[PDB]
Amino acid sequence: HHWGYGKHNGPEHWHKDFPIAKGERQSPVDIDTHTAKYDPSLKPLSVSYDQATSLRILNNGHAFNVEFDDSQDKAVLKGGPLDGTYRLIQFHFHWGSLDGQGSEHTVDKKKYAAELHLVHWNTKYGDFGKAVQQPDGLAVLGIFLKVGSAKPGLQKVVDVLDSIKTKGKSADFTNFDPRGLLPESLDYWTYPGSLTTPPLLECVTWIVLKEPISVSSEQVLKFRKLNFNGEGEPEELMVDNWRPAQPLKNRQIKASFK
Ligand SMILES: [Zn+2]
């Protein structure tokens, strides 16, 4: 049974094919802001996206991925909790069927309308495929989305979605600047975790920003027009593609701010 987000193949089923689903460092988690400790030894976070080169956008049947050329040292994350340099490979979102749900992480149980994941691999492991064999192979910057004013820098993504409606469709998607998706502040929480989709590998230093970005109702409505199914199969709207919060299991969440 191909994994997904439905009643018979959704998150409660994943552990059968991917037993790490019940591991010690699974994501997402609820961020209890009152038990996250400020860590003054955290270096400032460095998000350097000015030379980023997007290549393509792809509906993979679970979300849409905007992919980058990661063959050179061009869009990198470093500092904060990280001990090396991590290179951007792709970003994607999780979102709900309703504005009241859709994020993976929660903040004192609060769910946002959506959540953006910018996925980076540790350059000391040479590429993404080898990085995912390592416990510190990945760093994911998570950014919450709330519904309000439109985010202009998101609109180029919104407008290509009609060309990738169904699973397996891809489109050229060059010159997209992910700096237009970032909120003002880089204040964050950080904790060790996992990929939130199968194979759920425990490679990730999570860096979750406190400040959400606002997107318009119309922008998120266009996300909900995508399809999980392939062309020529019955239409199932791509909505509620979020894994719920998982047990923290005595991990600690650190805050970059007071
Ligand atoms: Zn994700």
Question: Which residue shows structure tokens 């040479």?
Answer: 126
CB contact at 8 A, 168 and 230 = yes
Expt. technique = X-ray
For 51-85, b where at least 16 C-beta lie within 10 A, e where not — what string?
ebbbbbbbbebbbbbbbbebeeebbbbbbbbbeeb
CB contact at 8 A, 3 and 13 = yes
Distance 243 CA to ligand 1 centre (A): 9
Closest among 250, 243, 232 to 191, alpha carbons compared:
250
Q: What is the stated resolution of the deposited model, in angstroms? A: 1.3
Breaks (C-N over 2.5 A) in the chain follow: none
CB contact at 8 A, 119 and 91 = yes
Distance 37 CA to ligand 1 centre (A): 25
Kindly write down the DSSP assignment for every residue of 10-44, as one continuous string: SGGGGGGT-GGGGSSS-S--EE-TTTPEE-TTPPP
Residue of 8, 13, 62, 120 marked active site: 62
Task: Parse the chain into domains and list their residue ranges.
Answer: 1-258
Is 62 an active-site residue?
Answer: yes
Annotated binding site for Zn(2+): 92, 94, 117
Quickly count: other Cβ atoms within 10 Å of residue 233's Cβ.
Answer: 11
Distance 18 CA to ligand 1 centre (A): 17
Q: How far apart are CA 138 and CA 86, in angstroms?
A: 7
Domain at 1-258, CATH from 1.10.287.130, 3.10.200.10, 2.60.120.960, 3.40.50.720: 3.10.200.10
Distance 114 CA to ligand 1 centre (A): 10
Annotated binding site for substrate: 196-197
Radius of gyration of the chain (CA): 17
